[PDB]
Design a protein around this nucleic acid. Structure first.
Ligand SMILES: [Cl-]
Lengths: 120, 120
DNA sequence: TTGCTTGTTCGCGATTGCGAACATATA
DNA sequence: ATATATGTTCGCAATCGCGAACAAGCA
């Protein structure tokens, strides 16, 4: 199963998690931005650990969506926080980083586009 | 109803549809990129027609997602096409533009991250 | 043994977000 | 009558994606 991530699959999961190339290269791949661009362009294969961390971030996203679903089924119309600046996010989440900020942006954007939540 | 879209809501739906600021400003707002950045930063209100066009694009996304859901319920593991370059997408879709390209990118990324489709 | 692999670094053109200024049309 | 909202253009620092070159680590 692991190790079959294509370059375009990596680009797609990165874009869906709403990560910039530099952010993922610095915090996930722990490599230069050029190496991440090479991975997404097909020059070098996607490392196994990078792929596994992608799936892990996907699972974290699933947890967030599940909490919001719990709130929805209870009759709530959620007012979800969509942090424009990363510093505003880290002021409310000291043990997080830009990865969690982008994940929160993605979940809030999805639940607004679906029409179930308003963003503040 | 129309006119309640905030700046952050516009930014969120734009990023969800995987649109760049320049693309949305050129093809959707039909304004300069500076005016779109002003809209998304809260300098001026989001026009009603731009809002409604956002919602219409969301509906088109729902159409695509429903087609792929039908394919999934039939037992198929979809091999979704993720176009890295816009010219490839337009060569496969003559009557489309960058909006449909970004919509298809977002949908394919969603169905790959969910774990139901492979990208080619 | 060294070709394929993979990473870093540098340079450069293209692109972006934003401040600032200008213009308009309209209440 | 006129502030005010809203669009445009211009310049600029910052950022990004890419080509090309260099280097280490192999198998
Ligand atoms: Cl409701």
């Amino acid at each position: 199963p692991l190790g079959s991530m294509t370059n375009k699959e990596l680009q797609a999961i990165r874009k869906l998690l709403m990560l910039d190339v530099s952010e993922a290269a610095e915090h996930i791949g722990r490599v230069s931005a050029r190496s991440w661009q090479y991975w997404e362009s097909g020059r070098s294969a996607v490392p196994d650990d990078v792929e596994q961390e992608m799936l892990d971030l996907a699972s974290v996203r699933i947890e967030m969506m599940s909490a919001i679903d719990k709130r929805l089924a209870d009759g709530e119309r959620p007012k979800l926080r969509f942090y424009n600046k990363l510093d505003e996010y880290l002021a409310d989440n000291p043990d997080h980083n830009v990865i969690g900020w982008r994940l929160s942006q993605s979940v809030a954007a999805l639940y607004y586009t679906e029409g179930h939540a308003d963003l503040i």
